[PDB]
Design a protein around this ligand. Structure first.
Ligand code: A1IT0
Ligand code: A1IT0
Lengths: 204, 204
């Protein structure tokens, strides 16, 4: 009776871990494919599942950080979104924090993604007339050559600058999508997805 | 490329169906055990998963009605909850609608549960001083012997009546819990729960 409830709770924790992995794989694919509504609905599902979990392995915490990073990147142009208790931190600043917190290799791709988020964190403020806020974002990030070029653009209030077109929002998204392509190949073999794909293939 | 995305979407629909079944089993157990916070968190998870599903088998629709019925029963005393587009329909009235919509046997237990919800739908209004609303609930439900006894109690405004203690809220909950005990035994063999319990048992 007391042992039965204990065995049930452990089984629920096992199933929840499988649901979290599947939902991360679904979120990464939606981000890659640009399926905006599917990403929104899948994020709602991962949030709910995460609140029903208590114990997290190091791998599950990395998986959660991935969902969080993609959620902030998708909301990168939504300056009204508050992802941290400090109301000043913009969505791309919150993404940059999670990017530097994941236990992952700091390869060339990692650094390019980091620098593209830094430039775009400022650019999105400028492209909305929020020039004072761009300087405040700049001070929190920077905490050069590029550093002084960026301060010069904020100071000149030239929102439509050629620098923000070379290191564009679309370039940041494409570099992030190439990274998500590695996460997708890694989680394609998780339990729920593997068992679901096997049921589908058996009906072909 | 176009066929790959199609196979992925079908696998996601298969996994979602397994998540819906597991989450119904988790919700029924929480209701039975009286684990209020676990029920609230699990309901949040089933809602999110349901919004990510498009096709529903007849069995999945029955499963959803079960989650809905238990959700309204749990909110039975919360008269500020609006479960239908018509703002007048109280939570126990909304539960009675789903109870008469499930494709299930109309055994003795089914009818006892139906009649206990009818009496309590009125009683909860009286026990909050909402006497006019109790008469309005009574008219929508009824739409005797019991019928005239109930009208007499509403008319006398005797909120604390001996009738509402014999056919009490606790009796309605206990009868509903015995029914949930049958749903729990039926869904204990669903894919995700069976596979999770097997992982737990293998570590013992
Ligand atoms: C806005 S969020 O913080 O990014 N949302 C999650 C949460 O747990 O809050 C974290 C992982 C993605 C979905 C759920
Ligand atoms: C308030 S509710 O309507 O009862 N919520 C569900 C929904 O889909 O809205 C239905 C099944 C239970 C959880 C999700």
């Amino acid at each position: 009776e007391e042992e039965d409830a204990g065995l049930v709770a452990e089984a629920e924790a096992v199933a929840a871990g499988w649901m979290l992995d599947f939902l991360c794989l679904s979120l990464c694919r939606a981000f890659r494919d640009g399926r905006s509504e599917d990403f929104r609905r899948t994020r709602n599902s991962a949030e709910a599942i995460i609140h029903g979990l208590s114990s997290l392995t190091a791998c599950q915490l990395r998986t959660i950080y991935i969902c969080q990073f993609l959620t902030r990147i998708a909301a990168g142009k939504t300056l009204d979104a508050q992802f941290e208790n400090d109301e000043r931190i913009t969505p791309l600043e919150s993404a940059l924090m999670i990017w530097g917190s994941i236990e992952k290799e700091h390869d060339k791709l990692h650094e390019e993604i980091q620098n593209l988020i830094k430039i775009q964190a400022i650019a999105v403020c400028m492209e909305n007339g929020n020039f004072k806020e761009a300087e405040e974002v700049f001070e929190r990030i920077f905490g050069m050559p590029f550093k002084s070029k960026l301060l010069m653009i904020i100071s000149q209030k030239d929102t439509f600058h050629s620098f923000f077109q070379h290191f564009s929002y679309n370039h940041m998204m494409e570099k992030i999508k190439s990274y998500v392509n590695y996460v997708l190949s890694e989680k394609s073999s998780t339990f729920l997805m593997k068992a679901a794909a096997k049921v589908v293939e058996s009906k072909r």
